[PDB]
Design a protein around this ligand. Structure first.
Ligand code: ZMA
Length: 391
């Protein structure tokens, strides 16, 4: 006869309430910043709002649900199922939101040309609504028959003094583990994570490929120029210039038409000269190109470089969220795995179970800090609010 469980429950409940406090405050701040700042009103941040909404729900409902379910109190089976699986609904919502963010940034970085023509607030709202609905379908799947209401714990039901029909409300007693591992973890959680990793890999790959392409064009431009200065034949000049022309109109694909028009025009003129056997005429005419480069091309390619740097930094910041999501949630899934795939093992200790539950809950508090740390716009919007209504 050992330590009173309420002593541990005091800690657990206090920790849970603190986590709820932070989860509500941080995410409320996020939503407020997005609502009043017009720079933060794009399709990409609407998913941020949805994620923050799920986190608010965690702080308002899932945590109280966790505190209640932990009691093992007497309630009808299906009611206990809802209480236990509402967090699954929210977690699936978060999954779909993160995956939507990844796909949005992918579409933005590979085809920004037709990004707006494809991605709008209308279709985004339709997506988010469909995502919430499918999250409900997934999370509450157990209530559609895939439960253990038909296999109750006679000993427990009669120990805790429950009514006819009712059952004690614990997780592993009503929520089947094959569902948690196969259906929820392997299919509806792990696979999405693999997909997110793939998409972000493709994002960074495309950013690197574009920077190398523009760099090859820039180097082709200047190297052909140097070749002109060193060449000693009209045909050698025209060869280098034709290839410089190709590189010029290639880098063009990356107000600004003025610069590239001047460059390509100068290249056409140098070509016409070289074709008419006019060598040094071409070498001198192609020497003014560098000015056109020092006034337009360099100024455009540095700006394209900074734009890709910004999108890369944004992709990194948005991927860190998925990282923390995985790190906070996977421990419970691993615990479920070895609660399902090892009958010869000893079950994980109760303190470790609640520790992992608390950990999974902490994910609803990190996102705002990530935003304020990484994203200048979010940071300074939070700053204004913090120095607008309350200090
Ligand atoms: N395995 C598990 N257990 C619990 N709570 C109850 C643990 C327990 C274990 C033994 C016992 O006699 C009474 C209760 N909550 C849990 N939540 C989750 C979870 C949430 C999201 C993914 O897995 N897994 N999970």
């Amino acid at each position: 006869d050992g330590a009173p469980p309420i002593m541990g429950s005091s800690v657990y409940i206090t920790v849970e309430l603190a986590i709820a406090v932070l989860a509500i405050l941080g995410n409320v701040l996020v939503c407020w910043a997005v609502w009043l700042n017009s720079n933060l009103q794009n399709v990409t941040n609407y998913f941020v709002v949805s994620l923050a909404a799920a986190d608010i729900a965690v702080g308002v409902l899932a945590i109280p649900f966790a505190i209640t379910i932990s009691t093992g109190f007497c309630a009808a089976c299906h009611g206990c199922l809802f209480i236990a699986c509402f967090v699954l609904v929210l977690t699936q919502s978060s999954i779909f939101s993160l995956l939507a963010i990844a796909i949005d940034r992918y579409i933005a970085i590979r085809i920004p040309l037709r990004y707006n023509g494809l991605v709008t607030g209308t279709r985004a709202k339709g997506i988010i609504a469909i995502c919430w609905v499918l999250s409900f379908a997934i999370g509450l799947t157990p209530m559609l028959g895939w439960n253990n209401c038909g296999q109750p714990k006679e000993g427990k039901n009669h120990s805790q003094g429950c009514g006819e029909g009712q059952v004690a409300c614990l997780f592993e007693d009503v929520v089947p583990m094959n569902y948690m591992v196969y259906f929820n973890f392997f299919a509806c959680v792990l696979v999405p994570l693999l997909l997110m990793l793939g998409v972000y890999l493709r994002i960074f790959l495309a950013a690197r490929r574009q920077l190398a392409d523009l760099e090859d064009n820039w180097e082709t431009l200047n190297d052909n120029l140097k070749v002109i200065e060193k060449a000693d034949n009209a045909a050698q000049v025209k060869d280098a210039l034709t290839k410089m022309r190709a590189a010029a109109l290639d880098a063009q694909k990356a107000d600004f038409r003025h610069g590239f028009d001047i460059l390509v025009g100068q290249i056409d003129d140098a070509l016409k000269l070289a074709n008419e056997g006019k060598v040094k005429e071409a070498q001198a005419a192609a020497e003014q190109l560098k000015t056109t480069r020092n006034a337009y091309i360099q100024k455009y390619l540095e700006r394209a470089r900074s734009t890709l740097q910004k999108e890369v930094h944004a992709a990194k910041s948005l991927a860190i969220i998925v990282g923390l999501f995985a790190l906070c949630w996977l421990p419970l899934h691993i615990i479920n795995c070895f609660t399902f795939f090892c009958p010869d093992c000893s079950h994980a200790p109760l303190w470790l179970m609640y520790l992992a539950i608390v950990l999974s809950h902490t994910n609803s508090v990190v996102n705002p800090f990530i935003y304020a740390y990484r994203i200048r716009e979010f940071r300074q919007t939070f700053r204004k609010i913090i120095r607008s209504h309350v200090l």
